[PDB]
Amino acid sequence: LSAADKGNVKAAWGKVGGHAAEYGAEALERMFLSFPTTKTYFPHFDLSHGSAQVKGHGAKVAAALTKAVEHLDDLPGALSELSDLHAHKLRVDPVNFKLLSHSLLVTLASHLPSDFTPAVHASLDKFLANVSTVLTSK
Amino acid sequence: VLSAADKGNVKAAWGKVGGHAAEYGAEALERMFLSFPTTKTYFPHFDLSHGSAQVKGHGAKVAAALTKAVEHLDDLPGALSELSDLHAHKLRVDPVNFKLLSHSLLVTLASHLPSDFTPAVHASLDKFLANVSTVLTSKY
Amino acid sequence: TAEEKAAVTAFWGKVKVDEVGGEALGRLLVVYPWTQRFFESFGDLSTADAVMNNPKVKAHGKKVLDSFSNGMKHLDDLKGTFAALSELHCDKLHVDPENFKLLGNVLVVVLARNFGKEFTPVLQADFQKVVAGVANALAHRYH
Amino acid sequence: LTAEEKAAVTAFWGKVKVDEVGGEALGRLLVVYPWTQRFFESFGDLSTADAVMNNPKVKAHGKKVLDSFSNGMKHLDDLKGTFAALSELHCDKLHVDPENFKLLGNVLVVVLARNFGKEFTPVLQADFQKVVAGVANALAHRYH
Ligand code: HEM
Ligand code: HEM
Ligand code: HEM
Numbered sequence: 001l002s003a004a005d006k007g008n009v010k011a012a013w014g015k016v017g018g019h020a021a022e023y024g025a026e027a028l029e030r031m032f033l034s035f036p037t038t039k040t041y042f043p044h045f046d047l048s049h050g051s052a053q054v055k056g057h058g059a060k061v062a063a064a065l066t067k068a069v070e071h072l073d074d075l076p077g078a079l080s081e082l083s084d085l086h087a088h089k090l091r092v093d094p095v096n097f098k099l100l101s102h103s104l105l106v107t108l109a110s111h112l113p114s115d116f117t118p119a120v121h122a123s124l125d126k127f128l129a130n131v132s133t134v135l136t137s138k
Numbered sequence: 139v140l141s142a143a144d145k146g147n148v149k150a151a152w153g154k155v156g157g158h159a160a161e162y163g164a165e166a167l168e169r170m171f172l173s174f175p176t177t178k179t180y181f182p183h184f185d186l187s188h189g190s191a192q193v194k195g196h197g198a199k200v201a202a203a204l205t206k207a208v209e210h211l212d213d214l215p216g217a218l219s220e221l222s223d224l225h226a227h228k229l230r231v232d233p234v235n236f237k238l239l240s241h242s243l244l245v246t247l248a249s250h251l252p253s254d255f256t257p258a259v260h261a262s263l264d265k266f267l268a269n270v271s272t273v274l275t276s277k278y
Numbered sequence: 279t280a281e282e283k284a285a286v287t288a289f290w291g292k293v294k295v296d297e298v299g300g301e302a303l304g305r306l307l308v309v310y311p312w313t314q315r316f317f318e319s320f321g322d323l324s325t326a327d328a329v330m331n332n333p334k335v336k337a338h339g340k341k342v343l344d345s346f347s348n349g350m351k352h353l354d355d356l357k358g359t360f361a362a363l364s365e366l367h368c369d370k371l372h373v374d375p376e377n378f379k380l381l382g383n384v385l386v387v388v389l390a391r392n393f394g395k396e397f398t399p400v401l402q403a404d405f406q407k408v409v410a411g412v413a414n415a416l417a418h419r420y421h
Numbered sequence: 422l423t424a425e426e427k428a429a430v431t432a433f434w435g436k437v438k439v440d441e442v443g444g445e446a447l448g449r450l451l452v453v454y455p456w457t458q459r460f461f462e463s464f465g466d467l468s469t470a471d472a473v474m475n476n477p478k479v480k481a482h483g484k485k486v487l488d489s490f491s492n493g494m495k496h497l498d499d500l501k502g503t504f505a506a507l508s509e510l511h512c513d514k515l516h517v518d519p520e521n522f523k524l525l526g527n528v529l530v531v532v533l534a535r536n537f538g539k540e541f542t543p544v545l546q547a548d549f550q551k552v553v554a555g556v557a558n559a560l561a562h563r564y565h
């Protein structure tokens with residue numbers, strides 16, 4: 001991530017604001033509907049629309065992304081805890097992170113149309129790619 | 139990033155390569171062109187026949203770049219900063235192609251170093267060839 | 279399916295291929311810069327604003343979504359609708375089929391930005407099936 | 422596969438010790454790409470590389486994967502039908518992402534190269550890269 005990329009990410013996440021958990025839940029609901037194979041990682045969740053488990057998990061996902069935005073210079077240090085979870089414990093297939101990052105970009109573009117510029121789109125794709133690389137590491 | 143055990147396996151594997159680096163790098167290219175002919179479109183100016191002086195020479199340049207990366211495992215972005223600009227900005231190589239070249243390199247090394255190409259070294263070299271790819275696909 | 283087909287076709291009548299096409303192709307060239315390699319004759323692609331304002335990009339992007347609109351009317355024969363385009367992208371342009379999925383994913387993002395709440399998750403999921411089929415039909419000649 | 426390419430791949434396949442190559446390929450896939458262990462966590466101890474390569478169920482399942490490969494080697498003009506049943510198992514029941522099919526097909530090539538050395542020529546490898554591509558695609562047919 002370049003200085004211009006970091007600047008776009010911090011700016012875009014500021015417009016998100018208090019809607020992070022709300023957007024993180026939608027991005028999950030978009031993932032599960034568009035890519036049903038991702039459902040196999042949440043067999044204990046009820047994945048119907050309006051499920052409290054999908055709402056709850058979307059908040060934890062958005063909280064993790066906010067932690068990553070505030071620690072853009074040290075993503076491995078800010079996400080070492082979740083990297084151990086998704087790699088050793090959960091063994092999530094790396095293809096799935098591309099599916100979630102796409103679902104997040106679709107959600108952000110849907111709610112922030114005027115701020116979702118091509119320059120920001122490119123920066124957010126590169127941020128979500130770095131976040132994934134950290135979680136797929138180890 | 140590469141672990142301390144990863145770096146040791148890479149340094150050991152490349153040590154067994156030794157004076158065959160330029161020779162293995164030319165074979166990996168010839169394997170890539172034969173297995174993945176779409177990669178040829180990046181070298182329209184090259185004679186791509188078997189035993190070509192251009193393919194032989196470029197494989198030596200590729201092998202030398204990998205050697206510089208093995209010797210600078212702690213700073214791959216800095217050691218390959220010039221090559222990252224060339225591949226991403228000047229050439230604009232599709233990132234899928236680096237997976238094909240890495241696979242071709244793994245096949246070349248496994249063919250020539252069977253007893254040393256253990257699963258542990260296989261895992262380390264793949265992790266290594268992927269970091270080099272990420273460095274060269276950075277600055278995109 | 280039939281109910282998915284009817285919802286996807288009804289939503290497509292509201293899409294202005296003119297703009298959505300030029301934005302989808304421009305965003306592909308910006309977000310995934312290695313695809314500029316195939317459009318270097320289009321001229322200035324050095325900056326984001328240059329790509330988005332490039333007249334040939336806006337013009338080509340309209341044709342891509344027109345080709346997309348043509349596949350929309352043949353959802354039960356995408357392989358035959360794009361058979362000629364598959365040969366062009368595979369035998370002549372040498373575009374890696376991974377990029378078809380990239381463009382289809384950018385198109386979905388462009389639709390989400392231009393329609394907001396109307397681009398529901400259920401509707402997005404149906405459109406992901408289309409862009410997966412279009413990308414597969416365009417990658418048919420590689421197999 | 423052309424007639425000449427098909428004749429070269431079939432003749433080389435007669436030398437392949439399927440039991441050894443199959444267990445090594447599936448073992449190396451589990452060591453190099455550890456997220457694939459998620460689908461074989463029933464096999465027992467995969468906690469280290471030597472455990473995976475000496476796990477008796479990994480050597481047994483690899484022979485089955487390469488026998489399926491050998492069965493596909495007899496039907497090079499009909500991979501989609503030979504693997505139609507297997508494509509639906511990995512998709513609708515096992516939920517294996519089709520990216521992993523090419524990952525295993527590529528590991529198999531590396532395993533063939535290590536096991537045969539100079540006789541695994543680049544020309545022969547390209548022919549085998551065609552087969553693993555066709556096999557991986559036939560297994561991913563029931564996803565699309
Ligand atoms: C940027 C990408 C991602 C982020 C930031 C993220 C973040 C998180 C967080 C914060 C948790 C909760 C940890 C805890 O409560 O202790 C979690 C758990 C989990 N994640 Fe993700 N994740 C990402 C990608 C994925 C993907 C792509 C999948 C699967 C397709 C996945 C599957 C899971 C599962 C199954 C859990 C367990 C939750 C539970 O059992 O309650 N994650 N992740
Ligand atoms: C580990 C991966 C790679 C390494 C270490 C590498 C290294 C190099 C080096 C050292 C050069 C010559 C630079 C110079 O002469 O100053 C070069 C040039 C080039 N590379 Fe690569 N490269 C890699 C991957 C790739 C791939 C995957 C492709 C295409 C599929 C590619 C396409 C090219 C092209 C077209 C040139 C221009 C050569 C010429 O004009 O003579 N590179 N690369
Ligand atoms: C994914 C859906 C796509 C569709 C529906 C599509 C459709 C089309 C159409 C209709 C044309 C016009 C052909 C003609 O005028 O004869 C075209 C040309 C072209 N396409 Fe695509 N395309 C797609 C993806 C891509 C991608 C991903 C790339 C590159 C990364 C690409 C690169 C090109 C190029 C270079 C041309 C020729 C431009 C020129 O003549 O200067 N296409 N495509």
Ligand code: HEM
Pocket residue numbers: 457460461463485486487489490507511515517521522525526556557560
């Ligand atoms: C060329 C590629 C592949 C071929 C030919 C193949 C073939 C087969 C066959 C024949 C079986 C039946 C086993 C039996 O009946 O005992 C099977 C089962 C299975 N496959 Fe594959 N497979 C391939 C790739 C993969 C990959 C890449 C994965 C996971 C990453 C996978 C996961 C599984 C699992 C979990 C089972 C069931 C294990 C069990 O029965 O306990 N397969 N496969």
